[PDB]
Amino acid sequence: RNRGRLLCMLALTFMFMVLEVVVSRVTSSLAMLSDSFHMLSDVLALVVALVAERFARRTHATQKNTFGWIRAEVMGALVNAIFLTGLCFAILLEAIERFIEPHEMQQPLVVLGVGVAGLLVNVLGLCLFHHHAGQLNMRGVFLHVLGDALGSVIVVVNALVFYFSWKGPCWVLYLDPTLCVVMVCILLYTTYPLLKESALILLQTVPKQIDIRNLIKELRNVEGVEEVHELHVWQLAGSRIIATAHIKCEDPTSYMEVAKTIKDVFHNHGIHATTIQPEFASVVPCELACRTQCALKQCC
Amino acid sequence: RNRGRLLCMLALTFMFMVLEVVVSRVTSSLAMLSDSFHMLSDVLALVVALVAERFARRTHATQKNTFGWIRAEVMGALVNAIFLTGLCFAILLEAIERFIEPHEMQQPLVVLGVGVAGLLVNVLGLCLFHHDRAGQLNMRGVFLHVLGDALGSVIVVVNALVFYFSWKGPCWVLYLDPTLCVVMVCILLYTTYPLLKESALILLQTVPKQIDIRNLIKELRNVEGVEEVHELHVWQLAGSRIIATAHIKCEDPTSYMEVAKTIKDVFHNHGIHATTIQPEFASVVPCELACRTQCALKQCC
Ligand SMILES: CC(C)CCC[C@@H](C)[C@H]1CC[C@H]2[C@@H]3CC=C4C[C@@H](OC(=O)CCC(=O)O)CC[C@]4(C)[C@H]3CC[C@]12C
Ligand SMILES: CC(C)CCC[C@@H](C)[C@H]1CC[C@H]2[C@@H]3CC=C4C[C@@H](OC(=O)CCC(=O)O)CC[C@]4(C)[C@H]3CC[C@]12C
Ligand SMILES: CC(C)CCC[C@@H](C)[C@H]1CC[C@H]2[C@@H]3CC=C4C[C@@H](OC(=O)CCC(=O)O)CC[C@]4(C)[C@H]3CC[C@]12C
Ligand SMILES: CC(C)CCC[C@@H](C)[C@H]1CC[C@H]2[C@@H]3CC=C4C[C@@H](OC(=O)CCC(=O)O)CC[C@]4(C)[C@H]3CC[C@]12C
Ligand SMILES: [Zn+2]
Ligand SMILES: [Zn+2]
Ligand SMILES: [Zn+2]
Ligand SMILES: [Zn+2]
Ligand SMILES: [Zn+2]
Ligand SMILES: [Zn+2]
Ligand SMILES: [Zn+2]
Ligand SMILES: [Zn+2]
């Protein structure tokens, strides 16, 4: 389903770019012809989303990657968030430039028509991506489409203002940069949670719904286990959470009695992919340690 | 010293921005002001590396992150690579626009002076970022960004010389800048693709290139204690820190610890030291310890 939405959006973007080039060649406008090439950024964003979605379905172990490419959509969401942040910074800088030196728009009616067409295309994109793991990439595309829609609304309003008012001509020239600044603020406000979540997923951060202190406290509550060390909890993608710990039991015969208990304790929380390594005999913190232990070759 | 390196580079970037602003104000040319305000891309590129370097020295286990923030350097390298690729694509679009309609600068002399100052700053940056593995990645990203800046400065200096010595006015001189810009973006994309690939692979839990999964599992199954090995997950955290987890089946819990020493030694022969091996003592039974409500969306691989 997601691939169809992305392909339809890509087709719409290409059609709109063709329309903009054609209308520029008819109207002999070089400025909006150059503006038409600015949709290659949205084409690239859609291509990145498509690649991430295509690779996210290879959820099988591979000689190159043991987990499969389940982390592809989260990577694509991070890339799209970074690209959108860069675009927001660039258009904020451009708005500052227009503040410093004002810009006059030529042919308001053609620009208004192109803006209405772009707004309709972006509304179709929003109706494609209104969302009714994989949600990260989809919301990354949705934020870019929403930014495009806001830009289209701004340019339509700007064209209407020049056509209706421009021949107080002084304040009219400054309506575009302030609206662009407001749109940058809104876009960054909506994009920061997505970028934060993606970056915190790529880093091996504990998911926000799991507290390590409580998990450790319940882990020591099992009768067989004596102490828990080297506890690593991280999120692969979506609800795929992997937990790893070392335990001391001092009773290999009843290990399955307490291994199932530890599995149940992990299963009570949103953890189902675990790997618990027992150790049997306190000078050494961990019996199974490397012969030449180095801080540069071990986790944490 | 790495942090002081980035502080020195940031200070030089800021003072060159101030110099560009002053030159714009005295010269009363808006192009210099526009360039000075566009130069903030390097300020953000250095700030990202500084943040990553500061945050990745916290290798201790944190409440929010049990592995520490040692992956922050690789994250910063990836962010710098993506930012550089975006800047390259923007440069390519600008070159296309210049090809469609050319641009002529008003005063070659001021452009030449500003470009010479920027070229000196950038060659100092290269001499400064001349050079663990994760530390190299962030340094590699900033070095590539400074190299792209230096190539841009060389291009602008050469182009300014060409206008000052040739233009009075051939047609080809107006198109000298886009050709050099295209060459620059080609070279910079070629030299930044390996960094982006390496960073993205590291964050995608890719097996390090020096580990063969088939050989590893064949060696693991070769020891006497184990009966079979299933769900062998191997991934690289950052630099030379590789974590490998596996599930094994032993003959009996008695004398299991000898099997664990042998498996640890087998992993230690390869570049893996931070391991975790879960024995599964005794239907097909792929894994004795499995969740009751098995789901493909709630499990690794
Ligand atoms: C397009 C690319 C090249 C750049 C993307 C923007 C970055 C420059 C931004 C995005 C999110 C930012 C981070 C968001 C949150 C924080 C936590 C912040 O921690 C604090 O000190 C918070 C205050 C406190 O705890 O006292 C330090 C800056 C940092 C890492 C920020 C550093 C700058 C970042 C990486
Ligand atoms: C003169 C201005 C227009 C230039 C600088 C613009 C941006 C660099 C700033 C302006 C307001 C900032 C935002 C103000 C508030 C927040 C909320 C906060 O993130 C959250 O969403 C946390 C929860 C919350 O505050 O509701 C911190 C980031 C963010 C988006 C900030 C991101 C950076 C922004 C967009
Ligand atoms: C928004 C921008 C700035 C993001 C960064 C640029 C991306 C558009 C590029 C950077 C690396 C590229 C990837 C590099 C490697 C590959 C592998 C390639 O697959 C193969 O190697 C096929 C081999 C074969 O069988 O012939 C498919 C394209 C892809 C995913 C590329 C897709 C486009 C990517 C993500
Ligand atoms: C207006 C016209 C003249 C513009 C022409 C632009 C091209 C000459 C540029 C644009 C993007 C460049 C590509 C960007 C990224 C890469 C990846 C880089 O890494 C590899 O793929 C390794 C070599 C290989 O595996 O083939 C090789 C160069 C290449 C294909 C570049 C080749 C030259 C390209 C196609
Ligand atoms: Zn867009
Ligand atoms: Zn479970
Ligand atoms: Zn241990
Ligand atoms: Zn550890
Ligand atoms: Zn730079
Ligand atoms: Zn198992
Ligand atoms: Zn070892
Ligand atoms: Zn698995």
Side-chain angles (χ1 to χ4, degrees), chain A residues 2-134 136-166 168-207 209-210 212-216 218-222 224-249 252-253 255-256 258-281 284-300, chain B residues 2-135 137-167 169-208 210-211 213 215-217 219-223 225-250 253-254 256-257 259-264 266-282 285-301:
Chain A
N2 291 332
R3 196 187 153 78
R5 311 279 179 81
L6 295 180
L7 280 179
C8 180
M9 197 63 213
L10 196 47
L12 273 170
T13 304
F14 266 122
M15 183 278 288
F16 189 44
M17 182 179 72
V18 168
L19 183 63
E20 278 186 348
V21 176
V22 159
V23 71
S24 179
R25 298 294 296 163
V26 176
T27 57
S28 296
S29 179
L30 275 300
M32 174 213 54
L33 175 58
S34 296
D35 174 78
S36 67
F37 273 117
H38 289 166
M39 299 195 66
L40 294 174
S41 66
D42 304 357
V43 171
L44 197 66
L46 266 288
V47 162
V48 161
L50 267 169
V51 166
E53 182 65 26
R54 193 153 47 71
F55 275 107
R57 311 218 298 280
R58 284 85 170 93
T59 65
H60 295 285
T62 315
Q63 295 297 289
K64 184 71 162 131
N65 194 62
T66 52
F67 296 94
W69 303 109
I70 309 154
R71 262 195 175 179
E73 69 275 16
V74 178
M75 186 66 204
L78 172 74
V79 164
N80 263 307
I82 290 172
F83 191 62
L84 187 54
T85 291
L87 285 188
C88 288
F89 279 151
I91 62 170
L92 182 63
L93 183 63
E94 182 65 26
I96 296 299
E97 286 182 59
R98 280 75 178 272
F99 268 112
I100 287 161
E101 176 251 341
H103 273 236
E104 183 42 66
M105 180 181 67
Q106 298 318 117
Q107 297 173 355
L109 294 174
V110 170
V111 176
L112 161 71
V114 166
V116 169
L119 167 63
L120 294 174
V121 160
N122 298 140
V123 159
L124 289 176
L126 295 172
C127 284
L128 283 177
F129 309 130
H130 63 267
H131 296 286
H132 297 304
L136 285 178
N137 201 18
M138 290 324 297
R139 185 177 65 246
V141 182
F142 181 84
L143 289 179
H144 191 117
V145 175
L146 173 80
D148 298 340
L150 281 178
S152 315
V153 166
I154 279 174
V155 68
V156 175
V157 163
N158 205 41
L160 284 177
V161 172
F162 292 102
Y163 177 95
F164 269 38
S165 298
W166 179 265
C170 298
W171 73 257
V172 163
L173 294 174
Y174 295 144
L175 184 67
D176 178 33
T178 176
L179 282 197
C180 281
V181 161
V182 169
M183 179 255 303
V184 166
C185 282
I186 289 173
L187 260 189
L188 280 185
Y189 186 79
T190 56
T191 318
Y192 180 75
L194 168 77
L195 177 63
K196 199 194 97 186
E197 175 156 28
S198 300
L200 287 198
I201 291 187
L202 277 296
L203 304 151
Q204 308 287 75
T205 63
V206 178
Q209 72 259 7
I210 297 169
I212 298 302
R213 292 180 179 91
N214 299 319
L215 200 44
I216 282 288
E218 319 188 59
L219 273 173
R220 281 75 178 272
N221 283 348
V222 176
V225 64
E226 294 294 328
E227 61 86 20
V228 175
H229 70 280
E230 197 77 31
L231 178 81
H232 287 309
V233 174
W234 52 284
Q235 184 184 7
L236 178 80
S239 179
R240 280 162 151 120
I241 301 180
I242 297 89
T244 292
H246 298 192
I247 57 168
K248 287 185 183 291
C249 295
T253 305
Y255 169 50
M256 288 324 193
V258 307
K260 289 279 181 179
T261 309
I262 285 179
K263 181 64 70 177
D264 291 331
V265 162
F266 270 119
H267 175 88
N268 302 329
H269 313 75
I271 290 165
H272 308 275
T274 81
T275 305
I276 302 299
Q277 165 201 305
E279 306 171 16
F280 308 95
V284 290
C286 182
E287 292 157 353
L288 270 191
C290 189
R291 319 183 170 277
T292 60
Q293 187 175 4
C294 171
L296 262 62
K297 293 183 186 296
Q298 270 177 354
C299 58
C300 71
Chain B
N2 290 318
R3 163 156 184 104
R5 202 152 293 182
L6 299 158
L7 277 296
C8 182
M9 200 45 210
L10 193 53
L12 275 178
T13 292
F14 266 114
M15 61 79 71
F16 185 66
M17 201 165 310
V18 168
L19 168 80
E20 281 217 356
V21 168
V22 176
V23 172
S24 179
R25 180 193 84 190
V26 193
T27 300
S28 179
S29 59
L30 272 300
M32 295 296 172
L33 183 140
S34 69
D35 198 1
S36 56
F37 269 129
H38 303 139
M39 184 177 177
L40 277 149
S41 296
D42 305 359
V43 168
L44 282 71
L46 281 152
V47 159
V48 169
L50 210 45
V51 163
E53 193 272 332
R54 186 218 314 163
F55 266 120
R57 277 185 299 111
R58 316 174 186 250
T59 71
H60 294 89
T62 305
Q63 183 62 255
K64 181 69 176 177
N65 188 357
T66 50
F67 285 100
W69 298 107
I70 76 166
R71 189 164 265 191
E73 287 191 356
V74 181
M75 177 79 36
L78 175 87
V79 166
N80 275 319
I82 296 169
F83 188 35
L84 185 57
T85 302
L87 287 178
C88 286
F89 283 149
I91 285 159
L92 183 63
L93 293 180
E94 182 65 26
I96 288 309
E97 271 179 67
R98 272 178 210 151
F99 263 119
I100 301 299
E101 58 89 19
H103 282 276
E104 200 170 339
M105 65 182 179
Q106 278 190 10
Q107 315 189 297
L109 277 296
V110 163
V111 182
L112 183 63
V114 162
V116 162
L119 179 51
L120 271 295
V121 165
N122 293 319
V123 299
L124 189 153
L126 273 73
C127 278
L128 187 62
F129 299 122
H130 178 202
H131 298 98
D132 200 72
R133 326 297 182 231
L137 286 184
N138 198 29
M139 278 316 119
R140 181 66 178 171
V142 298
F143 170 64
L144 292 170
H145 188 108
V146 179
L147 172 70
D149 303 332
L151 292 178
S153 53
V154 169
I155 279 173
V156 70
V157 159
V158 164
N159 194 6
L161 278 164
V162 171
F163 292 104
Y164 184 48
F165 283 146
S166 68
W167 176 272
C171 295
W172 69 265
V173 65
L174 271 176
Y175 294 112
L176 185 48
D177 184 76
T179 303
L180 289 189
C181 285
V182 162
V183 167
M184 182 179 72
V185 65
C186 286
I187 297 169
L188 184 61
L189 282 189
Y190 172 84
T191 191
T192 195
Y193 176 74
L195 173 71
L196 180 46
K197 176 179 179 288
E198 196 164 341
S199 301
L201 285 184
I202 289 172
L203 282 71
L204 278 157
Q205 311 289 137
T206 314
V207 181
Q210 66 267 18
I211 301 299
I213 284 299
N215 298 4
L216 206 52
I217 194 150
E219 293 178 354
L220 284 177
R221 293 197 281 250
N222 268 355
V223 300
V226 65
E227 294 293 328
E228 62 86 20
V229 176
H230 55 286
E231 185 177 1
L232 175 65
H233 285 308
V234 179
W235 52 282
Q236 179 184 2
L237 185 45
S240 179
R241 300 185 181 188
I242 301 158
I243 302 103
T245 63
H247 301 200
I248 61 157
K249 295 185 147 94
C250 295
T254 304
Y256 152 72
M257 205 73 198
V259 179
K261 300 294 187 291
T262 48
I263 288 180
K264 182 64 70 177
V266 164
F267 271 119
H268 178 77
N269 284 353
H270 304 251
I272 302 169
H273 307 283
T275 76
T276 297
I277 306 300
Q278 166 179 309
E280 297 185 353
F281 315 118
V285 176
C287 193
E288 278 82 342
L289 309 172
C291 174
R292 319 177 308 201
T293 70
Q294 283 182 356
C295 173
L297 274 75
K298 277 168 219 287
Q299 66 183 357
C300 65
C301 73

